[PDB]
Structure 1
Amino acid sequence: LSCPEGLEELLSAPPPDLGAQRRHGWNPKDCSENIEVKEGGLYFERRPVAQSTDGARGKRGYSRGLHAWEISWPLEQRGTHAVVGVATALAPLQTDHYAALLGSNSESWGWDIGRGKLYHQSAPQYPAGTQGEQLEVPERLLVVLDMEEGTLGYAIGGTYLGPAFRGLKGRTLYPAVSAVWGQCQVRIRYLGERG
């Protein structure tokens, strides 16, 4: 079990209420001009814009403890580049072409849930020693940020897939995605903190 200490307890707790999910949800003040944050942070909608990759950060950056949130991203709303992970407050959230914007720099770490590749200033396959064409990330995935070990990993159907990224200790990291699909609806559900 490569699971962060306390992940089972965090997931077994009463989930954060709607207020908390909104406080830790997408930031309307920290997203691409082509993204509209909906329901006070619970999801965003990318506007139908040609030749654009558009990202969003969570309202809250984490520097300590164990944090987890579920992303819900419908399979038919992913297009060519659907990347899920974290960013510093300095990651660019918009570019004028279709690309894996999340993880294309020093300020972001992303899992391409289409191709299964890991991007940081960039790619290895995740999970460990799988083939991309041989995997399909379902609609809901858990993002697991352990700021005690300085790790980012993912869980699918409540199974942790191990650490995707290491070396994160001493950073302040925000939930993030970058998207290319017009009118995609990407849900974030904060599941809480331990610590």
Structure 2
Amino acid sequence: RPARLDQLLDMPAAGLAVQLRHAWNPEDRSLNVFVKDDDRLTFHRHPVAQSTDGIRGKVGHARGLHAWQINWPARQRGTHAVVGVATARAPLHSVGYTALVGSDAESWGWDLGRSRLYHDPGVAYPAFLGPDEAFALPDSLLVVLDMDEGTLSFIVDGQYLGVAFRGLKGKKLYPVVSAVWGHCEVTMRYINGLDPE
């Protein structure tokens, strides 16, 4: 479904000021993660017993085709390391280890460890993966949000991987992430957007 995606990716990527406006929101997060003091593009998870922790981006998209880059080293990431989008009503912390992005009707996510899609559950993505199989992801991916068609999809190392979710029109959705393990650091860079007329 890359509609104006080739156009969006041909644009020079947005510079630092736009990247920062679209970045992790230091005031819309689990009490157990923080945006770093010298890198406002990167949050750090700082755990205590049995917690799943999330953070939303500053901008909720009701509109346009948008693309952002997530760096999460593969090393720092196992199961229930989820990348996706969420309503402003998605719980951003839980007690225990869960798929919190995708927990309820308020969030949609891709488990980078399991290659499974979450939303209320447990569907495989990319669809060409077989049973007991996972896509071997590198340190970064692209999250492609289309609030005009109402879909979510991902690119990894140049490959468009398919539409992951549909039915997202009429909502306002932010870059979100949730992690269950370790002192992870997840960078996000807004790449670009094409707004409607």
The TM-score range, normalised by the shorter chain, is over 0.9
**Residue aligning to 2:159:** 159
| Matched residue SS, 1:55 | strand
Contact 1:21 1:41 in 2 (8 A): no
| Matched residue SS, 1:11 | helix
Contact 2:52 2:180 in 1 (8 A): yes
**Could you tell me which amino acid in structure 2 is paired with residue 7 of structure 1?**
L
Structure number with the higher strand fraction is 2
**Residue aligning to 2:176:** 176
User: Which has the higher mean CA deviation after the structures are superposed, 73-82 or 184-193?
Assistant: 73-82
For 1:93 and 1:27, the matched residues in 2 are separated by 12
For 1:147 and 1:40, the matched residues in 2 are separated by 28
**TM-score under structure 2 normalisation?**
0.94
Q: Deviation of residue 180 (structure 1)?
A: 1.2
| Matched residue SS, 1:127 | coil
Contact 2:111 2:117 in 1 (8 A): yes
Q: Deviation of residue 40 (structure 1)?
A: 5.6
| Alignment pair present for 1:192 and 2:177 | no
**TM-score under structure 1 normalisation?**
0.95
Q: Deviation of residue 122 (structure 1)?
A: 3.6
For 2:14 and 2:134, the matched residues in 1 are separated by 34
Contact 2:79 2:114 in 1 (8 A): no
Give CA deviations for 1:103-136 in whole Å, capped at 9, x if unaligned: 0101000001101111011421001131353421
For 2:127 and 2:80, the matched residues in 1 are separated by 21
Contact 1:109 1:165 in 2 (8 A): yes
Runs of 5+ consecutive residues of structure 2 not aligned to the other structure? none
| Matched residue SS, 1:144 | strand
For 1:85 and 1:119, the matched residues in 2 are separated by 9
For 2:39 and 2:149, the matched residues in 1 are separated by 31
**Residue aligning to 1:7:** 5
| Matched residue SS, 1:178 | strand
Contact 1:23 1:41 in 2 (8 A): no
| Matched residue SS, 1:42 | strand
| Alignment pair present for 1:46 and 2:45 | yes
Contact 1:25 1:40 in 2 (8 A): no
| Matched residue SS, 1:9 | helix
| Matched residue SS, 1:168 | coil
| Matched residue SS, 1:102 | coil
Between Structure 1 and Structure 2, how many residues are aligned?
193
Contact 1:67 1:194 in 2 (8 A): yes
Q: Deviation of residue 193 (structure 1)?
A: 0.6
| Matched residue SS, 2:67 | strand
User: Which has the higher mean CA deviation after the structures are superposed, 176-185 or 90-99?
Assistant: 176-185
**Could you tell me which amino acid in structure 2 is paired with residue 81 of structure 1?**
H
Quote the sequence identity (%). Answer: 58
**Residue aligning to 2:35:** 37
**Could you tell me which amino acid in structure 2 is paired with residue 6 of structure 1?**
R
**Residue aligning to 1:66:** 65
**Could you tell me which amino acid in structure 2 is paired with residue 71 of structure 1?**
I
| Alignment pair present for 1:88 and 2:87 | yes
Q: Say what the alpha-carbon RMSD is for the aligned residues.
A: 1.3
Alignment of 1:49-128 (within 5 A): 49-128=48-127
Q: Deviation of residue 138 (structure 1)?
A: 1.3
Contact 1:53 1:99 in 2 (8 A): yes
Runs of 5+ consecutive residues of structure 1 not aligned to the other structure? none
